[PDB]
Structure 1
Amino acid sequence: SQLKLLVTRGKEQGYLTYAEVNDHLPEDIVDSDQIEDIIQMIN
């Protein structure tokens, strides 16, 4: 998956900003609630 590279990216940099999270999301994730829950997962 692509979010794997996002998690390793955040671990490389030591952080993760809303820009990169909005980029690396599953494209057809239309659900803002699962959006919030997946960022709450990565955090």
Structure 2
Amino acid sequence: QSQLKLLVTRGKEQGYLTYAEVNDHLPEDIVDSDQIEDIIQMINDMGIQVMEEAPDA
């Protein structure tokens, strides 16, 4: 709900891929070097359909 709606509605498509934005709108412990790659992989490349492969994952 929160993560899905915020990610999708905001990123349309953030133009310059504003990375420093939604990473703060994410819960749990931050400043990790793990969740970094899981966001730079979904925004571009396989556009549209990738944004549906993200939530399901």
Q: TM-score range by the shorter chain?
A: 0.3 to 0.5
Change (3 A) 1:40 1:34: same
Post-superposition, which runs of at least 4 consecutive aligned residues in structure 1 deviate over 3 A?
A: 12-16
For 1:13 and 1:7, locate their aligned partners in 2 and report how far apart those are by CA, in whole Å.
10
Indicate the structure (1 or 2) with the bigger Cα radius of gyration: 2
Gaps of 5+ in 2: 45-57
What's the CA shift for 1:16? 3.6
Deviations 1:1-43 (A, max 9, x none): 3242122111165454122132222333564223312331233
Quick check: which one's helix share is greater?
A: 1
Same amino acid, percent of matched pairs: 100
Q: TM-score, normalised by structure 1?
A: 0.43
Q: CA RMSD in A?
A: 2.8
Gaps of 5+ in 1: none
Q: TM-score, normalised by structure 2?
A: 0.40
